[PDB]
Subunit: 120 residues, 4 copies
Amino acid sequence: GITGTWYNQLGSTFIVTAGADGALTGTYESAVGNAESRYVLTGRYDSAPATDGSGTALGWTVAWKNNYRNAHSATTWSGQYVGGAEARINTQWLLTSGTTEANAWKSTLVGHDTFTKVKP
Amino acid sequence: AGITGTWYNQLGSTFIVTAGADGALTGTYESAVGNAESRYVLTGRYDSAPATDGSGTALGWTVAWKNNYRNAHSATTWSGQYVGGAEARINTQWLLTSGTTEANAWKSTLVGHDTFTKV
Amino acid sequence: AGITGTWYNQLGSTFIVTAGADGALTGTYESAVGNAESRYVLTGRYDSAPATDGSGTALGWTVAWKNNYRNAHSATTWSGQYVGGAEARINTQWLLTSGTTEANAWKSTLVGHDTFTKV
Amino acid sequence: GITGTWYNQLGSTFIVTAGADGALTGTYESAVGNAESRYVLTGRYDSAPATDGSGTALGWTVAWKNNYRNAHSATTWSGQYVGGAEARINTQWLLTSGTTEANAWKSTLVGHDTFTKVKP
Ligand SMILES: COC(=O)c1ccc(-c2cccc(-c3ccc(C(=O)OC)cc3)c2NNC(=O)CCCC[C@@H]2SC[C@@H]3NC(=O)N[C@@H]32)cc1
Ligand SMILES: COC(=O)c1ccc(-c2cccc(-c3ccc(C(=O)OC)cc3)c2NNC(=O)CCCC[C@@H]2SC[C@@H]3NC(=O)N[C@@H]32)cc1
């Protein structure tokens, strides 16, 4: 299932609980792995996916503020979970920083992360 | 107080949100487009201690397009910033991912942009 | 004739383009923002036999941000559609990738949207 | 170098010439590999990249019309070339279809392709 501990290709750790009715809740950490590296996340997933072999759509957000650091920015990941022997979450993400209006054109980075349950 | 309220976008969609002191966003979304009807749950996060220079407040939220009436097997995330003042706005870009087979994964994700106006 | 001409976007940038019968786009771009000065070469492609229903004409182009004056070690692609008529527009989304090291590759690419008006 | 024959994870083939002053020109084909699968591409690249170990920025466009088929759509790839023993082009792409104004919200797909010179 979705619930568990996931790792992406940057060594970030994504610890998530999937609620019965579609909630995602947990913590997202950089590869450093200490308290300063950890941030709250919340999101949603399709809690009744199709039964035709399709993945399970989901998304979540981290705002990059914790008790140690604030980068004045937020990332959202949008993607799908694929179960089976080597479960995976395949995502694309948007990382928006707070900017002036003049700098808004360079406010948003885009990328892609793939998560598995294999600890590096 | 700034983020909390009712917002409409350029497509006529409805975003009702409460911003909590801990950085939480919670509310409901009604889409003007696509395989959707009635309200959907949303959840997200925002920077609860934004810069006090002249920059926006970063935020994001997710809707999974399942409620008690319909299920589109998909989810949208909006990533953007809130700009306060007399004419408050939230400027976003979004990613809408559908659950797909592996063979269709290459075309799972739509991208676009929405601007919300506070009402 | 429709696409061919001079276009400005919401940031004040200048897009001069010729659309060839074979689907080619060729021209020059002047950016209002970023590490850029004077004109840059652009090249792209468009659908030279678009639908004749009420839909836009798909197109895209690239600028590498190197000319004889400056080099930002980056390139933007715009992907979008042309809508003709008395008030012609090109509505685009864009990706701006910088050359990076491997360690910085995760933050190589900006995304946004530009609307162009024909003048 | 960039000039040569590349393949992505979908088995598409990207045959490109990189001109001295920044032009990219060539053909892009689906995994089917026949005439009907092939389309013209043009783009640009940084013809004087940094010398600090950074990749080479580039982009290109395909409009999905040839003498056989027309999908009324265009893809742009934006990314970077990384040289060395296993050269790679890492990209993100935007695929826009011509739509009515009412359907413009669902006009644009986003994804990512990685290219190598290894023929599947
Ligand atoms: C007023 O002060 C500031 O404005 C300020 C202060 C400190 C730092 C800072 C300094 C060093 C490192 C980070 C950092 C780097 C990476 C990660 C990370 O990947 O966490 C998962 C977290 C923090 C720093 N913060 N940067 C962030 O919080 C943004 C992290 C974005 C990570 C992105 S999300 C998409 C992609 N997927 C990942 O797993 N990671 C990347 C930035 C800004
Ligand atoms: C009036 O008629 C129409 O509107 C019409 C007619 C036929 C078809 C059609 C039918 C079957 C297959 C294709 C097709 C599929 C894939 C590829 C391909 O990947 O080529 C590289 C090309 C064509 C078909 N066309 N589709 C396209 O040309 C779009 C291909 C988009 C491929 C994307 S670019 C990003 C990503 N990276 C790749 O390498 N491939 C994918 C679509 C529309």
